[PDB]
Protein backbone atom coordinates (compact mmCIF):
# COMPACT_ATOMS: atom_id res chain seq x y z
CA UNK A 1 0.00 0.00 0.00
CA UNK A 2 1.55 3.31 -1.12
CA UNK A 3 0.44 6.74 -2.40
CA UNK A 4 0.54 7.68 -6.07
CA UNK A 5 -1.24 9.08 -9.12
CA UNK A 6 -3.88 6.51 -10.06
CA UNK A 7 -4.07 5.61 -13.77
CA UNK A 8 -6.46 2.83 -14.66
CA UNK A 9 -4.86 0.60 -17.32
CA UNK A 10 -2.63 2.85 -19.51
CA UNK A 11 -1.97 6.19 -17.79
CA UNK A 12 -5.51 7.49 -18.18
CA UNK A 13 -6.17 8.91 -14.69
CA UNK A 14 -9.12 7.68 -12.58
CA UNK A 15 -11.03 10.79 -13.78
CA UNK A 16 -12.31 12.83 -10.73
CA UNK A 17 -15.45 14.85 -11.38
CA UNK A 18 -15.35 15.01 -7.55
CA UNK A 19 -12.95 13.90 -4.79
CA UNK A 20 -15.29 11.33 -3.19
CA UNK A 21 -15.59 9.59 -6.59
CA UNK A 22 -11.79 9.44 -7.05
CA UNK A 23 -11.53 7.99 -3.55
CA UNK A 24 -14.34 5.45 -4.14
CA UNK A 25 -12.97 4.19 -7.48
CA UNK A 26 -9.51 3.94 -5.97
CA UNK A 27 -10.68 1.80 -3.06
CA UNK A 28 -12.70 -0.29 -5.56
CA UNK A 29 -9.99 -0.98 -8.17
CA UNK A 30 -6.58 -0.04 -6.66
CA UNK A 31 -7.45 -0.72 -2.97
CA UNK A 32 -6.63 2.75 -1.71
CA UNK A 33 -8.06 3.97 1.57
CA UNK A 34 -8.70 7.35 -0.16
CA UNK A 35 -7.75 9.80 -2.97
CA UNK A 36 -9.01 13.01 -4.61
CA UNK A 37 -8.32 15.51 -7.39
CA UNK A 38 -4.71 16.43 -6.63
CA UNK A 39 -3.37 19.39 -8.73
CA UNK A 40 -3.93 17.68 -12.12
CA UNK A 41 -4.74 13.98 -11.40
CA UNK A 42 -6.44 11.47 -9.11
CA UNK A 43 -4.19 10.99 -6.18
CA UNK A 44 -4.72 7.92 -4.16
CA UNK A 45 -3.59 7.02 -0.65
CA UNK A 46 -3.33 3.23 -0.14
CA UNK A 47 -3.12 1.79 -3.75
CA UNK A 48 -2.32 -1.84 -2.90
CA UNK A 49 -2.08 -2.94 -6.47
CA UNK A 50 -0.15 -0.47 -8.66
CA UNK A 51 -1.29 -0.44 -12.26
CA UNK A 52 1.45 2.05 -13.26
CA UNK A 53 0.91 4.95 -10.88
CA UNK A 54 2.28 8.28 -12.14
CA UNK A 55 5.24 10.25 -10.88
CA UNK A 56 4.18 13.06 -8.53
CA UNK A 57 6.25 16.26 -8.43
CA UNK A 58 7.54 17.14 -4.94
CA UNK A 59 5.58 20.37 -4.80
CA UNK A 60 2.45 18.42 -5.87
CA UNK A 61 3.13 15.69 -3.25
CA UNK A 62 3.74 18.31 -0.57
CA UNK A 63 0.64 20.29 -1.68
CA UNK A 64 -1.41 17.08 -1.68
CA UNK A 65 -0.04 15.56 1.58
CA UNK A 66 -1.14 17.69 4.56
CA UNK A 67 -4.67 17.55 3.13
CA UNK A 68 -5.13 14.04 4.60
CA UNK A 69 -1.57 13.25 5.86
UniProtKB/Swiss-Prot annotation:
Excitatory insect beta-toxins induce a spastic paralysis. They bind voltage-independently at site-4 of sodium channels (Nav) and shift the voltage of activation toward more negative potentials thereby affecting sodium channel activation and promoting spontaneous and repetitive firing. This toxin is active only on insects. Expressed by the venom gland. Belongs to the long (4 C-C) scorpion toxin superfamily. Sodium channel inhibitor family. Beta subfamily. Its main location: secreted. Keywords: Amidation, Disulfide bond, Ion channel impairing toxin, Neurotoxin, Secreted, Signal, Toxin, Voltage-gated sodium channel impairing toxin. The keyword Transport does not apply. This is Beta-insect excitatory toxin BmKIT1. The keyword Secreted applies. One of its GO terms (molecular function) is toxin activity. Residues 2-65 form the LCN-type CS-alpha/beta domain. It comes from Olivierus martensii. One of its GO terms (cellular component) is extracellular region.
